[PDB]
């Protein structure tokens with residue numbers, strides 16, 4: 512199919528900087544994704560989000576704003592949460608590529624995937640992470656492993672697109 | 682072992698005529714997150730600047746060590762190989778590598794103390810035909826054809842991320 516990417520929900524939890532929402536929206540659009548969900552964002556709507564969303568204001572316009580992570584994950588068949596610190600057994604830890612493979616398996620099965628991203632400052636709570644079935648870590652310099660929020664979104668969606676293309680022989 | 686990590690230092694990130702200083706800071710952070718250190722800026726419109734420092738949270742060291750130059754030729758001096766980036770994956774000039782092939786070509790070239798430059802363009806205009814001609818390889822990140830180009834910092838992040846992924850795999854991870 513090609514409407515597969517529309518079944519990927521990008522969930523941003525309690526975003527502090529509105530420019531990161533715009534940046535995430537742009538990263539999404541560049542990769543073929545459209546469904547953005549915001550859980551209690553600090554400031555939204557906001558000019559800085561629009562500013563950073565060059566060519567992707569439509570995503571921001573269609574964004575769902577909710578009060579809880581539970582509400583954000585409603586209807587999903589699989590939830591993958593991002594972690595920049597590291598592993599919690601028994602939850603499996605995957606890299607961006609493995610994340611992409613799982614996403615497409617679920618999409619091909621006609622499921623709904625959710626990709627969860629945390630706060631710039633604190634990330635995701637343990638409680639939030641536990642609502643996920645898989646955890647995803649972007650390999651990085653251990654002394655400086657925290658990527659900008661929108662940049663993390665870009666890496667994941669990129670891998671997702673790469674996996675989707677390959678599944679098509681592209 | 683240890684000089685494995687030193688390989689990444691030999692990868693020069695070149696930003697050509699950057700308009701928004703936030704993008705310079707974003708690029709620097711993306712580089713640092715991936716283990717890269719060397720930033721070269723060709724005629725930035727505004728630098729140094731506060732937005733760059735802010736965007737480069739924790740990666741100010743890269744900004745500090747950045748070299749600012751008048752020409753691309755200057756920027757590439759001492760490099761071994763040059764890879765350029767193209768937002769368009771249109772057919773007419775010079776066959777394109779994806780980020781993965783790009784990561785591999787970059788690593789192969791780090792052999793025998795080689796120096797590699799990764800070149801990025803202007804937020805609106807990209808790289809000129811002349812600038813691209815200075816590149817031996819041209820890289821395109823696959824993206825939705827119907828829509829736009831990636832933000833400049835986001836593009837630096839994808840390429841540097843692929844470089845780290847290849848570099849890690851080569852070590853057994």
Ligand SMILES: Nc1ncnc2c1ncn2[C@@H]1O[C@H](C[C@@H](N)CC[C@H](N)C(=O)O)[C@@H](O)[C@H]1O
Pocket residue numbers: 593594595596627628629630631632633634635647648649650651656657658659660663
């Ligand atoms: N290396 C990474 N792997 C996976 N996600 C990351 C990574 N770096 C940043 N992110 C994402 O970016 C969001 C915002 C980060 N700045 C938060 C970092 C926070 N200190 C943490 O411990 O995760 C994180 O919650 C993740 O969603």
Ligand SMILES: Nc1ncnc2c1ncn2[C@@H]1O[C@H](C[C@@H](N)CC[C@H](N)C(=O)O)[C@@H](O)[C@H]1O
Pocket residue numbers: 766767768769800801802803804805806807808820821822823824830831832833836
């Ligand atoms: N899909 C992509 N593939 C390779 N590089 C990209 C891609 N998207 C953005 N970039 C990089 O980010 C820079 C700035 C872009 N926003 C410029 C887009 C411009 N309209 C063009 O067609 O070049 C480009 O010069 C590239 O360095």
